[PDB]
Design a protein around this ligand. Sequence first.
Ligand SMILES: */C=C\C(=O)Nc1cc(Nc2nccc(-c3cn(C)c4ccccc34)n2)c(OC)cc1N(C)CCN(C)C
Length: 315
Amino acid sequence: GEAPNQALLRILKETEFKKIKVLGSGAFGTVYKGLWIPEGEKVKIPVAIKELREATSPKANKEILDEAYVMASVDNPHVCRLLGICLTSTVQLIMQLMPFGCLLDYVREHKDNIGSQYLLNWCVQIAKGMNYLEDRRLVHRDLAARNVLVKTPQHVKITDFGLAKLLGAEEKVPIKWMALESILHRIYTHQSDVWSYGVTVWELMTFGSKPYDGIPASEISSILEKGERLPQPPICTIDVYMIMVKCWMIDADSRPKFRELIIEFSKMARDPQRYLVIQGDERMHLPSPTDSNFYRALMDEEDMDDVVDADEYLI
Ligand SMILES: */C=C\C(=O)Nc1cc(Nc2nccc(-c3cn(C)c4ccccc34)n2)c(OC)cc1N(C)CCN(C)C
């Protein structure tokens, strides 16, 4: 009883885009930072290009095209979407570049300049994107700070949809972010994503700390069974920590819904200093450059007058 998926999959020529630098390296793949120019459209679009290292793994090609399938089928401001794929010897996935990187690295880099208003706003936007995924009956199953990307300090989107799956669908795991029911019984739900959302929030509030640092994963399942949970971050009022605790309840239907988390964090974002206590909160500012020179430096391209962000390139 699911509806037909009429998303369009766009195929791009390798000549249309160029790679500038390597963002990340991995056995499965390499991610580049690039420019994409559509033919005879006179626009330059900053992109991240995802390349798996070799065609040789059957699972691997299945893996990236499943990811392309999911990214092509979502459309939301807090969800990363796919610009297209290139059918090279190895399949390339082309997605919009998020210039400020992943939220985990950003939070660590900028812990000294990050204010309560940004932290609570990121919490709203993540919840919004996750709620959109729930509307689409999509269970992410890998929600984490590392998988949230920063378009601007004001704007973040969810990413890493490779393990994303439909809700009732039959079917190096990260145990620390996982619901207990996921760990014990491979059960995955929107409400198991809510648990992962709690841990992601805890990461942001701890400015990038590692959860259960120094604890072996094999141990983690037992810890949770006892009722141990992640500790209350220093900057966190009991109101915020309590939200985190509700996401980590054993009864999964007991946990909050993403649409509720939007509401609650949004309310808090109206009086941020009442809910997060951060030294010198008022003083702090985070740089948010809109302009063409910022791109020229980032893309190392002399002429960026025709730059257009993916969000403004609509088909
Ligand atoms: C958490 C690491 C990270 O995101 N680093 C990063 C990312 C970007 N922008 C960007 N935009 C879209 C997609 C990606 C991306 C996707 N995948 C699977 C990645 C793996 C590894 C790295 C990036 C990936 N990234 C960025 O844009 C300018 C910069 C950036 N930097 C420079 C931090 C690099 N550290 C890992 C050292």
